[PDB]
Amino acid sequence: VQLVESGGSVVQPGRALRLSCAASGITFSSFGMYWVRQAPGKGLEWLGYIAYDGSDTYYADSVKGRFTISRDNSKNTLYLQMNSLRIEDTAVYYCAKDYYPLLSYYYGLDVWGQGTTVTV
Amino acid sequence: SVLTQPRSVSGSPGQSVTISCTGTSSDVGAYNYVSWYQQHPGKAPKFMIYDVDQRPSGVPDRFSGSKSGNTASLIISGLQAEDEADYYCSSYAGSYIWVFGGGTQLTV
Amino acid sequence: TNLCPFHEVFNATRFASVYAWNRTRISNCVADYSVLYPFFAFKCYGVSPTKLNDLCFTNVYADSFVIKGNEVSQIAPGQTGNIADYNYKLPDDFTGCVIAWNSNKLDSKHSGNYDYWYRLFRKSKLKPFERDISTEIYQAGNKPCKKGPNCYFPLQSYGFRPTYGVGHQPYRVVVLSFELLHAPATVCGPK
Ligand SMILES: *[C@@H]1O[C@H](CO)[C@@H](O)[C@H](O)[C@H]1NC(C)=O
Ligand SMILES: *[C@@H]1O[C@H](CO)[C@@H](O)[C@H](O)[C@H]1NC(C)=O
């Protein structure tokens, strides 16, 4: 199950940007997905999580009310809708697969994508 | 509420080192859910230790860890030359929020 | 002059796994709570533990199971975690008491006690006092799990051992849930 990341670009501050990753195979619908951000020269930051059924979605306080996480169960793709990007929002964005299927959460992130580069 | 780590940890091949990360009584102490990730330059993080001491298939037995109070640590024994990587811990902060630590660079 | 059989759940030779906890219905009792009062934890919600004998109820349920010491904090209202959501859920308006004690001398076999299981993941989060004792293997892909790639087993074991630290060694917990119904109180202390 490879995670193929795309949607990165160089954008002007204040504008919106759509990020996504495609999950190979048919197991996408069985797992919850996470977003993680890593700014250059810095460590990792948790961005949010969406449940396998699309019901429960959580965000890190830093981006709460700004970023929206959603998924398309038929296309097997994960989306991140970014709004009002700021000067500081320059980083590589990763999506990741929950170690366990269905609702699990308290384990960790097993499968990571290569990372989408977003700059301002 | 970011977990504090050593910027860099020294060591040499054949020896053991420890990488600690500290939180507060509200996260690292309250929940035994500390997960450690191993990242190489130009590569996505690898899933290493989960639930404080447990490891997913594919992780060498030389990688372990422990927890005491509000401090969690990664224990690496028998350091090899390719163990040179940036390590991160992730704790459960409650209310369905996770926190990654600052990150530690391991040297050999 | 008819004492209540609380000892039957507290003095049990074996406790059920947390994924499949036991429930005992207690009624028709002169319920002295002195019998059940060194314990690890003794904390009550909505009911006074000092003179609990004086306030009586219609029915009380005793939920019994075994967990590890560092998971005891999840057996409380308002809490979340691997147990709180997938194994044993309490209501946010609990009126009762959670009693726990160390069982390292009973359950922690030196060979490894693998008779106690817990759930790793779930279809949906549990409702208060909901139990799920299904141990079917989950198929994430489109291939039979006859356990192999994309196959996951919901339950994992507590590898209890006498050489483990306190937070990783077994505790036996009994939750006493008191309730009032349309019926007159039936479980009341001595008088
Ligand atoms: C088991 O029964 C004995 C009766 O002598 C009592 O002293 C003991 O406290 C009981 N154990 C528990 C956990 O209630
Ligand atoms: C306790 O739980 C076990 C496991 O499901 C079951 O076999 C046993 O019959 C239960 N006993 C009671 C009194 O519920």
Author numbering:
A (entry chain H): 2 to 121
B (entry chain L): 2 to 109
C (entry chain R): 333 to 369, 373 to 481, 484 to 528
Paper passage:
Here, we describe a highly potent SARS-CoV-2 RBM-targeting mAb, designated VIR-7229, which has unprecedented activity across the entire family of sarbecoviruses. VIR-7229 recognizes an epitope in the RBD antigenic site Ia,28 which overlaps with the ACE2-binding site (i.e. the RBM), burying an average of 950 Å2 at the interface between the epitope and the paratope. VIR-7229 interacts with the RBD via polar interactions and shape complementarity mediated by all six CDR loops, with the heavy chain CDR3 (H3) dominating the paratope. VIR-7229 tolerates extraordinary epitope variability, partly attributed to its high binding affinity, receptor molecular mimicry, and interactions with RBM backbone atoms.
